[PDB]
């Protein structure tokens, strides 16, 4: 007598001033699930169509967000903008004018934290990604659907947008929603997954009736509600801070990665969203692939208020030239070099207050962060020709240590040398800040962090994980 | 320096309506001058144009209903940063 999706987002231990904007179809605002909690702005920008069907999509979704019996964040205030017509269709221009209306509403009558839900998608748009971005740098939390096309979400908007939470769907057996050639989108542009198949919500047929619907916007709806509750417990959260908590509190490694194309399984995060029960936060960022040149660089970057503590690389080929941490625009950035099929740059983006971080590039018993009180958070390594706690080890290679001055920070280095894939994970309570491979009797093509597990792929190989805690 | 963009999923394109996006530092009265300048020069060529909306608050620019033929003309307008053909979005 509790819908599967609501139980899934309940953590294994568990014990308003936020507003949630919604852009899609019309709404049955006098449906008992959502009645009184959903102000219909009556904003409208919908294309001409080429009655109970008109509001089915949005009624369901406002119900998933705040419905009285089947909503995630009951008691959340919602405002409704109409951007999709009766056939579920809208335009980018309609969605810009809609997002613009939200920001000018917020300037003209400010309120608390704002959570804009974008339960729509079209092809990659420069203009729509710019608008979501500039709205997010204003301090508004945008949550979006990954897309329903069994594809890479980076090819769609606003799913691919910078600084929007992109959510793919999963079903009651913790596997990706797939239906023929349709199904959830995936890839480095998907931030996490949420319940999105067989989701029971308010049905626009009656004021009391319910329907079961499926979609990446249903997954997005759980997360907008999780964020709405998150932002009332701690209204001061920046979007970087929220996304780190969203990742941290998710269920990790439950999805069956075999449902994704082979090349997208590393790029797709194995996270299923969950509410917080009742710290040092790190997330792994994957780069937009560089290219096939021998002089080829890909770049993964952290949020503005997010420090970069490690950097690594992955070549599906093996022929790689490493990675290095460099300052750009005043920010630490991770850059991976190709030999060469092509490479990814895998950054470890952490939230650390009261900490100054710096890169120390030197050869490989030396210590790189010799300044007393500084911690070694991550080791990078790059070379040009193709042939002991605060120390980075190498072979002919130039090392790029990242060292932070941090009072409460405590760091330990676990290693494990052995094959295709070697793993070593930080103990429970520690956060993996840096993941690196130590060479040997086998060529290694990459090392990347998967939550708190360090993963090195080879074809003797040593995985080297740096773990840090607070006190 | 000003570039044009349009959706790759060809059946989602919406030709004839364009989002003119000006540079970051452009003021709303500058954006309206630039948009009426387009209609001014498009009228000289015997084209009718409709400014459907002028943007400000998130990005500077405007939304114009016009022929794609005017895209060379519109790319050379001052302050222009890029132009993008309107396209369809769908409920997910």
């Amino acid at each position: 007598s509790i819908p599967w999706n609501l139980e899934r987002i309940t953590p294994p231990r568990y014990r308003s001033l936020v507003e949630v904007y919604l852009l899609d179809t019309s709404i049955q605002s006098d449906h008992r699930e959502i009645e009184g909690r959903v102000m219909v702005t009556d904003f409208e920008n919908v294309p001409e169509e080429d009655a109970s069907k008109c509001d089915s999509h949005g009624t369901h979704l406002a119900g998933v967000v705040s419905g009285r019996d089947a909503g995630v964040a009951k008691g959340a205030s919602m405002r409704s903008l109409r951007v999709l017509n009766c056939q579920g269709k809208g335009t980018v221009s309609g969605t810009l004018i809609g997002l613009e209306f939200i920001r000018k509403s917020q300037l003209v009558q400010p309120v608390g934290p704002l959570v804009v839900l974008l339960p729509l998608a079209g092809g990659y748009s420069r203009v729509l990604n710019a608008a979501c971005q500039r709205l997010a740098r204003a301090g508004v939390v945008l949550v979006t659907a990954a897309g329903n096309f069994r594809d890479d979400a980076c090819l769609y908007s606003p799913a691919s947008a910078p600084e929007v939470i992109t959510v793919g769907a999963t079903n009651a057996q913790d596997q990706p929603v797939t239906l023929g050639t349709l199904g959830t989108n995936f890839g480095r542009c998907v931030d996490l997954f949420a319940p999105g198949e067989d989701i029971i919500g308010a049905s626009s047929d009656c004021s009391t009736c319910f329907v079961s619907q499926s979609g990446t916007s249903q997954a997005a709806a759980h997360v907008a509600g999780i964020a709405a509750m998150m932002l009332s417990a701690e209204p001061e959260l920046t979007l970087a801070e929220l996304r780190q908590r969203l990742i941290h509190f998710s269920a990790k490694d439950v999805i069956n990665e075999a449902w994704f194309p082979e090349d997208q399984r590393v790029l797709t995060p194995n996270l299923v969203a969950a509410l917080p029960p009742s710290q040092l936060f790190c997330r792994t960022v994957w780069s937009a692939h560089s290219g096939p040149t021998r002089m080829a660089t890909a770049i993964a970057r952290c949020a503005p208020d997010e420090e970069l503590l490690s950097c690594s690389s992955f070549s599906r080929s093996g022929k790689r030239r490493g990675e290095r941490m460099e300052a750009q625009g005043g920010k630490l950035v991770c850059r991976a070099h190709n030999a060469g099929e092509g490479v990814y740059a895998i950054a470890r983006c952490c939230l650390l207050p009261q900490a100054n971080c710096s890169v120390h590039t030197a050869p490989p018993t030396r210590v790189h962060c010799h300044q007393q009180g500084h911690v070694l958070t991550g080791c990078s390594s790059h070379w040009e020709v193709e042939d002991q706690p605060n120390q980075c080890v190498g072979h002919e290679a130039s090392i790029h240590a990242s060292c932070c001055h941090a009072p409460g920070l405590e760091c330990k280095v676990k290693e494990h040398g052995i094959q295709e894939q070697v793993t070593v994970a930080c103990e429970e309570g520690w956060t993996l800040t840096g993941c690196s491979a130590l060479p040997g009797t086998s060529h290694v093509l990459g090392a990347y962090a998967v939550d708190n597990t360090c993963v090195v792929r080879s074809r003797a190989v040593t995985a080297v994980a740096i773990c840090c805690r607070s006190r | 320096t000003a570039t044009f963009h349009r959706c790759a999923k060809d059946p989602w394109r919406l030709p004839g309506t364009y989002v003119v996006v000006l540079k970051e530092e452009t003021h709303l009265s500058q954006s309206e001058r630039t948009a009426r300048r387009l209609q001014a020069q498009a009228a000289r060529r015997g084209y009718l144009t409709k400014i459907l909306h002028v943007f400000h608050g998130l990005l500077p620019g405007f939304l114009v209903k016009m022929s794609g033929d005017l895209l060379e003309l519109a790319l050379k307008l001052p302050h222009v940063d890029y132009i993008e053909e309107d396209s369809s979005v769908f409920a997910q």
């Binding site: 239906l179 619907q213 499926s214 979609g215 | -």
Partner: peptide, 10 residues
């Protein structure tokens, strides 16, 4: 799954 997004699910 529904057309507004009529096959069944689970």
């Amino acid at each position: 799954f529904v057309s507004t997004t009529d096959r069944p699910c689970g």
